[PDB]
Design a binder for this molecule. Structure first.
Ligand SMILES: COc1ccc(S(C)(=O)=O)cc1-c1cn(C)c(=O)c2ccc(-c3cn(CCF)nn3)cc12
Length: 127
């Protein structure tokens, strides 16, 4: 059984910015979700080997997790806030695609997603 390589968090030829919106995504959005009691299953790539989920990466072809997002934010990997927002939405959608409705992990994603939506509702206007 094998895991794929993780999503990239560094690419020197990808143009990058540090914007106030991206700072908010790190200081408010990521930090709020990361400290949550339900954050742990989403703090690193899904380890399909250790979890005995050989079909995970057969179904999920765009993996994403908050460990990757955290590294991307700390490395100033993004050009804009929408790119980072898309990563969070990919992570939530993957969870809903792979898992059964009402599974514990789905309730955990839903709780993080509720907070995510509350925080991005107040994404600051770009300076
Ligand atoms: C509590 O969930 C986790 C804990 C630790 C890590 S880990 C080693 O990567 O740090 C990952 C997860 C995890 C995350 N996500 C996003 C998922 O969709 C997901 C889906 C299924 C399972 C799972 C299924 N079964 C057997 C029943 F079929 N056992 N586990 C795990 C996950």
């Amino acid at each position: 059984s094998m895991n794929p390589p993780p999503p990239e968090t560094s690419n020197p030829n990808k143009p990058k910015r540090q914007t106030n919106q991206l700072q908010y995504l790190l200081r408010v959005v990521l930090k709020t979700l990361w400290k949550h009691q339900f954050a742990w299953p989403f703090q690193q790539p899904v380890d399909a080997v250790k979890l005995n989920l050989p079909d995970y990466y057969k179904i999920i072809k765009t993996p994403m997790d908050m460990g990757t997002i955290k590294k991307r934010l700390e490395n100033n990997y993004y050009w804009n806030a929408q790119e980072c927002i898309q990563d969070f939405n990919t992570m939530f959608t993957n969870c809903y695609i792979y898992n059964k409705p009402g599974d514990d992990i789905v309730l955990m994603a839903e709780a993080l997603e509720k907070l995510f939506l509350q925080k991005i509702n107040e994404l600051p206007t770009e300076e």
